[PDB]
Amino acid sequence: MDVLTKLLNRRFLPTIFKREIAHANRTGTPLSVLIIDVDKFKEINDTWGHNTGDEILRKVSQAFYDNVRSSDYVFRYGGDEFIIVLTEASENETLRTAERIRSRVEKTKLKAANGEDIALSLSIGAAMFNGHPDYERLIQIADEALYIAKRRGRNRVELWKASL
Ligand SMILES: Nc1nc2c(ncn2[C@@H]2O[C@H](CO[P@@](=O)(S)OP(=O)(O)OP(=O)(O)O)[C@@H](O)[C@H]2O)c(=O)[nH]1
Ligand SMILES: [Ca+2]
Ligand SMILES: [Ca+2]
Protein backbone atom coordinates (compact mmCIF):
# COMPACT_ATOMS: atom_id res chain seq x y z
CA MET A 1 0.00 0.00 0.00
CA ASP A 2 3.05 2.23 0.38
CA VAL A 3 4.85 2.75 -2.90
CA LEU A 4 7.98 3.86 -1.02
CA THR A 5 8.38 0.37 0.44
CA LYS A 6 7.99 -1.07 -3.08
CA LEU A 7 11.14 0.70 -4.34
CA LEU A 8 14.27 -1.45 -4.39
CA ASN A 9 16.95 -0.83 -1.81
CA ARG A 10 20.02 0.68 -3.50
CA ARG A 11 21.97 -2.30 -2.08
CA PHE A 12 20.54 -4.25 -5.04
CA LEU A 13 22.21 -2.00 -7.67
CA PRO A 14 25.42 -4.01 -8.18
CA THR A 15 23.47 -7.27 -8.22
CA ILE A 16 20.98 -6.18 -10.84
CA PHE A 17 23.43 -4.33 -13.03
CA LYS A 18 25.87 -7.16 -13.27
CA ARG A 19 22.98 -9.40 -14.30
CA GLU A 20 21.57 -6.96 -16.85
CA ILE A 21 24.95 -6.18 -18.41
CA ALA A 22 25.43 -9.91 -19.00
CA HIS A 23 21.93 -10.30 -20.50
CA ALA A 24 22.43 -7.20 -22.69
CA ASN A 25 25.75 -8.49 -23.98
CA ARG A 26 24.29 -11.90 -24.85
CA THR A 27 21.14 -10.67 -26.56
CA GLY A 28 22.32 -7.31 -27.92
CA THR A 29 19.57 -5.35 -26.15
CA PRO A 30 19.91 -1.67 -25.14
CA LEU A 31 20.37 -0.90 -21.43
CA SER A 32 20.09 2.54 -19.85
CA VAL A 33 19.76 4.43 -16.60
CA LEU A 34 17.80 7.43 -15.35
CA ILE A 35 18.86 9.33 -12.24
CA ILE A 36 15.97 11.38 -10.95
CA ASP A 37 16.09 14.18 -8.42
CA VAL A 38 13.15 16.24 -7.10
CA ASP A 39 13.46 19.95 -7.87
CA LYS A 40 13.78 22.43 -4.99
CA PHE A 41 12.61 19.85 -2.48
CA LYS A 42 14.00 21.93 0.40
CA GLU A 43 11.64 24.72 -0.64
CA ILE A 44 8.76 22.25 -0.86
CA ASN A 45 9.39 21.07 2.70
CA ASP A 46 9.91 24.62 4.00
CA THR A 47 6.67 25.84 2.42
CA TRP A 48 4.29 22.90 2.75
CA GLY A 49 5.84 20.88 5.59
CA HIS A 50 7.81 17.65 5.95
CA ASN A 51 4.63 15.53 5.81
CA THR A 52 3.67 17.11 2.48
CA GLY A 53 7.20 16.38 1.27
CA ASP A 54 6.74 12.72 2.22
CA GLU A 55 3.43 12.55 0.32
CA ILE A 56 5.17 14.05 -2.70
CA LEU A 57 7.81 11.30 -2.57
CA ARG A 58 4.98 8.76 -2.89
CA LYS A 59 3.39 10.61 -5.79
CA VAL A 60 6.63 10.72 -7.76
CA SER A 61 7.47 7.10 -6.95
CA GLN A 62 4.06 6.02 -8.20
CA ALA A 63 4.66 8.03 -11.38
CA PHE A 64 7.83 5.97 -11.92
CA TYR A 65 6.03 2.65 -11.61
CA ASP A 66 3.12 3.84 -13.76
CA ASN A 67 5.53 4.75 -16.55
CA VAL A 68 8.01 1.85 -16.61
CA ARG A 69 7.63 -1.92 -17.09
CA SER A 70 8.03 -4.81 -14.65
CA SER A 71 11.24 -5.66 -16.53
CA ASP A 72 12.62 -2.25 -15.50
CA TYR A 73 13.90 -1.48 -11.99
CA VAL A 74 13.19 1.45 -9.66
CA PHE A 75 15.48 2.20 -6.68
CA ARG A 76 15.44 4.66 -3.82
CA TYR A 77 18.89 6.22 -4.17
CA GLY A 78 18.80 9.11 -1.68
CA GLY A 79 16.42 11.35 0.25
CA ASP A 80 14.83 12.73 -2.92
CA GLU A 81 16.83 10.80 -5.50
CA PHE A 82 15.93 7.69 -7.47
CA ILE A 83 17.50 5.42 -10.07
CA ILE A 84 15.64 3.65 -12.83
CA VAL A 85 17.33 0.91 -14.83
CA LEU A 86 15.59 0.55 -18.18
CA THR A 87 15.99 -2.65 -20.14
CA GLU A 88 15.41 -2.92 -23.90
CA ALA A 89 15.12 0.86 -24.31
CA SER A 90 17.03 2.50 -27.15
CA GLU A 91 18.30 6.04 -26.75
CA ASN A 92 15.05 7.35 -28.23
CA GLU A 93 12.90 5.18 -25.98
CA THR A 94 14.99 6.10 -22.94
CA LEU A 95 14.45 9.81 -23.59
CA ARG A 96 10.75 9.21 -24.31
CA THR A 97 10.31 7.39 -20.98
CA ALA A 98 12.21 10.08 -19.06
CA GLU A 99 10.18 12.86 -20.68
CA ARG A 100 6.95 11.06 -19.85
CA ILE A 101 7.92 10.77 -16.19
CA ARG A 102 8.95 14.45 -16.09
CA SER A 103 5.72 15.58 -17.74
CA ARG A 104 3.43 13.40 -15.62
CA VAL A 105 4.96 14.77 -12.44
CA GLU A 106 4.81 18.40 -13.67
CA LYS A 107 1.09 17.96 -14.37
CA THR A 108 0.39 16.36 -10.99
CA LYS A 109 -1.66 18.98 -9.14
CA LEU A 110 -1.67 18.23 -5.43
CA LYS A 111 -3.81 20.51 -3.26
CA ALA A 112 -2.42 22.12 -0.11
CA ALA A 113 -4.73 22.63 2.89
CA ASN A 114 -5.53 26.15 1.59
CA GLY A 115 -6.68 24.80 -1.79
CA GLU A 116 -3.53 26.04 -3.52
CA ASP A 117 -1.92 23.86 -6.20
CA ILE A 118 1.51 22.69 -5.07
CA ALA A 119 4.16 23.27 -7.75
CA LEU A 120 6.29 20.19 -8.36
CA SER A 121 8.90 19.20 -10.90
CA LEU A 122 11.88 16.94 -11.25
CA SER A 123 15.12 16.75 -13.21
CA ILE A 124 16.48 13.60 -14.88
CA GLY A 125 19.88 12.58 -16.16
CA ALA A 126 19.81 9.72 -18.67
CA ALA A 127 22.62 7.62 -20.13
CA MET A 128 23.10 4.51 -22.28
CA PHE A 129 25.24 1.57 -21.21
CA ASN A 130 28.24 1.80 -23.55
CA GLY A 131 30.00 -1.48 -22.80
CA HIS A 132 32.41 -0.76 -19.97
CA PRO A 133 32.01 -3.58 -17.44
CA ASP A 134 31.72 -1.23 -14.43
CA TYR A 135 28.12 -0.08 -13.99
CA GLU A 136 29.35 2.69 -11.69
CA ARG A 137 30.72 4.54 -14.74
CA LEU A 138 27.21 4.51 -16.19
CA ILE A 139 25.81 6.03 -12.99
CA GLN A 140 28.55 8.70 -13.11
CA ILE A 141 27.69 9.84 -16.62
CA ALA A 142 23.97 9.86 -15.87
CA ASP A 143 24.71 11.98 -12.80
CA GLU A 144 26.71 14.42 -14.94
CA ALA A 145 23.68 14.72 -17.21
CA LEU A 146 21.45 15.27 -14.17
CA TYR A 147 23.66 18.11 -12.95
CA ILE A 148 23.38 19.71 -16.38
CA ALA A 149 19.57 19.38 -16.31
CA LYS A 150 19.63 21.17 -12.94
CA ARG A 151 22.04 23.90 -14.06
CA ARG A 152 19.95 24.61 -17.17
CA GLY A 153 17.00 25.44 -14.95
CA ARG A 154 15.46 22.15 -13.70
CA ASN A 155 12.20 20.54 -14.83
CA ARG A 156 14.36 18.93 -17.52
CA VAL A 157 15.66 15.67 -18.92
CA GLU A 158 19.25 15.62 -20.23
CA LEU A 159 20.78 12.70 -22.13
CA TRP A 160 24.51 12.32 -21.59
CA LYS A 161 26.55 12.99 -24.70
CA ALA A 162 30.19 13.89 -25.32
CA SER A 163 29.40 17.40 -26.56
CA LEU A 164 28.15 18.41 -23.11
N1 LIG B 1 10.01 15.28 3.48
C2 LIG B 1 11.26 14.68 3.29
N3 LIG B 1 12.39 15.48 2.94
C4 LIG B 1 13.67 14.82 2.74
C5 LIG B 1 13.78 13.48 2.88
N6 LIG B 1 15.04 13.13 2.65
C7 LIG B 1 15.73 14.25 2.35
N8 LIG B 1 14.90 15.29 2.41
C9 LIG B 1 14.89 16.70 2.21
O10 LIG B 1 15.19 16.86 0.96
C11 LIG B 1 15.92 18.27 0.84
C12 LIG B 1 16.86 18.23 -0.32
O13 LIG B 1 17.33 19.57 -0.47
P14 LIG B 1 18.67 19.90 -1.28
O15 LIG B 1 19.33 21.10 -0.69
S16 LIG B 1 19.96 18.32 -1.32
O17 LIG B 1 18.24 20.19 -2.78
P18 LIG B 1 16.85 20.68 -3.40
O19 LIG B 1 15.98 19.52 -3.77
O20 LIG B 1 16.18 21.71 -2.51
O21 LIG B 1 17.35 21.42 -4.75
P22 LIG B 1 17.85 20.79 -6.11
O23 LIG B 1 16.72 21.00 -7.10
O24 LIG B 1 18.09 19.31 -5.88
O25 LIG B 1 19.09 21.55 -6.51
C26 LIG B 1 16.52 18.48 2.03
O27 LIG B 1 16.01 19.74 2.64
C28 LIG B 1 16.14 17.32 2.92
O29 LIG B 1 15.85 17.67 4.21
C30 LIG B 1 12.59 12.65 3.25
O31 LIG B 1 12.69 11.43 3.38
N32 LIG B 1 11.37 13.27 3.44
CA1 LIG C 1 20.54 15.87 -5.08
CA1 LIG D 1 16.58 17.69 -5.06
Residues classed as catalytic: 80
DSSP E strand boundaries for 6-89: 8-9, 31-38, 73-78, 81-87
Instruction: Please tell me the total count of domains within the chain.
Output: 1
Q: The domain that contains 32 carries what CATH number?
A: 3.30.70.270
Quoted resolution (Å): 1.1
Q: How far apart are CA 96 and CA 102, in angstroms?
A: 10
Which ligand gives the minimal distance to the CA of 155? 1
Distances in Å between the Cα of 77 and the Cα atoms of 17, 34, 161 are 15, 11, 23
Environment of ion ligand 2 (residues, CB < 5 A): 37
Neighbours of 149 (CB within 10 A): 26
**What is the residue range of 28's domain?**
1-164
Give the Å distance between the CA of 19 and the centre of ligand 1. 31
Q: How far apart are CA 65 and CA 135, in angstroms?
A: 22
Which residue's CA lies nearest to atom 28 of ligand 1? 42
| Residue 9 annotated as part of some ligand binding site | no
Please provide the size of the chain in residues.
164
